[PDB]
Amino acid sequence: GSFVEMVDNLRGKSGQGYYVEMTVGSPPQTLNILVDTGSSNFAVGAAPHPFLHRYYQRQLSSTYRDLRKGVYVPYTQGKWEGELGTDLVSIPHGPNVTVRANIAAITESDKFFINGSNWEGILGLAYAEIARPDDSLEPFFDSLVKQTHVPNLFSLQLCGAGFPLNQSEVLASVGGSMIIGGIDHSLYTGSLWYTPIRREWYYEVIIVRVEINGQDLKMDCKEYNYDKSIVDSGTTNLRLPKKVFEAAVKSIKAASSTEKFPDGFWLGEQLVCWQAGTTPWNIFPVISLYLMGEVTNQSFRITILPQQYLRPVEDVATSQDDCYKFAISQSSTGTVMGAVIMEGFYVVFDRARKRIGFAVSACHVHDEFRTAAVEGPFVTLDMEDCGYNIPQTDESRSHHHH
Numbered sequence: 001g002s003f004v005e006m007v008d009n010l011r012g013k014s015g016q017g018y019y020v021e022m023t024v025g026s027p028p029q030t031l032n033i034l035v036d037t038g039s040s041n042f043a044v045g046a047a048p049h050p051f052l053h054r055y056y057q058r059q060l061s062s063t064y065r066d067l068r069k070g071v072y073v074p075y076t077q078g079k080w081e082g083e084l085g086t087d088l089v090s091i092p093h094g095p096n097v098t099v100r101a102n103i104a105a106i107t108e109s110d111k112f113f114i115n116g117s118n119w120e121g122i123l124g125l126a127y128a129e130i131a132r133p134d135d136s137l138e139p140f141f142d143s144l145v146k147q148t149h150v151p152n153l154f155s156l157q158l159c160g161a162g163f164p165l166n167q168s169e170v171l172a173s174v175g176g177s178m179i180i181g182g183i184d185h186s187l188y189t190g191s192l193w194y195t196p197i198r199r200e201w202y203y204e205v206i207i208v209r210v211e212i213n214g215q216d217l218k219m220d221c222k223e224y225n226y227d228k229s230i231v232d233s234g235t236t237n238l239r240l241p242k243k244v245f246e247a248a249v250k251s252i253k254a255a256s257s258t259e260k261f262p263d264g265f266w267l268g269e270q271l272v273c274w275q276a277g278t279t280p281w282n283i284f285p286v287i288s289l290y291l292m293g294e295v296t297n298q299s300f301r302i303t304i305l306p307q308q309y310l311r312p313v314e315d316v317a318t319s320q321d322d323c324y325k326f327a328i329s330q331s332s333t334g335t336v337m338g339a340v341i342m343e344g345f346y347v348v349f350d351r352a353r354k355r356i357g358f359a360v361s362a363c364h365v366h367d368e369f370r371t372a373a374v375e376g377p378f379v380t381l382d383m384e385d386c387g388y389n390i391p392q393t394d395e396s397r398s399h400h401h402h
């Protein structure tokens with residue numbers, strides 16, 4: 001219940017992801033790698049790029065093997081692509097093991113790397129189903145478990161920033177822990193509650209109820225999971241399906257109505273500020289997501305504060321003020337529980353038992369009046385099915401799974 005060596009092994013800049021130090025090759029080449037529960041490839045910069053100080057040099061590794069197959073991964077704003085291979089991989093502030101893993105050597109990319117983020121690659125921690133080019137490319141965590149005696153579980157404590165801030169010219173530093181193979185009891189307090197992983201592709205879960213400041217949104221619960229709900233350390237915001245987003249914003253606007261913010265604020269495109277230390281936290285409501293319990297007809301709730309959904313961004317021009325970005329945003333691809341959710345909680349990705357645990361994080365930002373909370377059970381007699389079934393395309397139906 002104590003993993004001192006892996007506590008505080010995450011770093012990053014606010015809004016630019018949390019990364020862990022990894023080594024690749026023989027002798028070990030250190031890179032900073034974004035921890036991403038929303039994808040399933042281990043992919044690292046492997047050629048010069050303007051935003052990289054360093055990259056994986058395959059020619060310098062005696063243990064590198066080329067798989068003689070390329071990989072191309074487009075997404076909304078751009079792409080990464082490169083060459084598949086295997087090499088020896090370790091996590092210096094992780095388990096004392098070295099594994100041979102698939103590595104996608106990124107040779108070309110567009111709007112992938114971010115100036116100043118300080119990471120050079122991505123560690124996709126989700127399941128094989130969503131790996132590229134296909135599900136036969138074994139993800140890193142699968143290789144780790146198979147090759148070692150590391151328990152099939154990892155846990156994440158993402159610790160977000162708060163005012164006062166150290167620097168005006170750079171983004172706020174963030175920290176956290178990725179405990180590989182276990183649960184560290186110093187990272188949480190109170191009860192640890194589990195929700196089932198609905199299906200092993202993304203870390204998919206089911207939300208059964210949503211409340212804003214104690215008030216039920218009263219929507220068909222399938223709307224909350226349209227077309228999926230996932231836990232994603234590779235997303236900054238809490239992202240909500242259109243209908244849910246609009247309902248949530250209406251409620252948050254109403255509660256906070258003493259303050260008249262520009263439309264740009266609610267779109268996440270503009271900061272709002274108060275004089276240092278005077279932020280009226282109490283005018284902003286708590287948000288509770290009720291997640292399906294392990295027991296039929298049970299749920300538990302995770303509750304977050306405005307300290308989680310209003311992200312601190314220090315303004316060079318107004319460094320005397322505390323300024324915030326609204327970090328709840330609209331989705332067309334379902335609910336995404338990103339850093340806005342995860343920074344409230346210690347989150348246990350219990351792959352062995354097909355479940356995700358939540359407990360109050362020992363590092364969450366709060367005040368003297370309210371705390372992020374994990375509470376249950378809530379019993380609902382004859383609880384409905386809140387899961388959505390994504391329409392099956394012919395292309396996906398046509399795949400064989402041998």
Ligand SMILES: CN1C(=O)[C@]2(CC(C)(C)Oc3ccc(-c4cccc(Cl)c4)cc32)N=C1N
Binds near residue numbers: 016114232
């Ligand atoms: C949603 N999501 C992505 O778009 C993605 C997809 C992938 C192809 C792995 O590329 C990236 C790259 C950077 C970030 C990023 C960039 C800045 C901050 C953060 Cl948290 C992540 C997120 C992703 N992984 C995700 N989970």
Ligand code: NI
Binds near residue numbers: 021092
């Ligand atoms: Ni080191």
Ligand code: NI
Binds near residue numbers: 400402
């Ligand atoms: Ni076949």
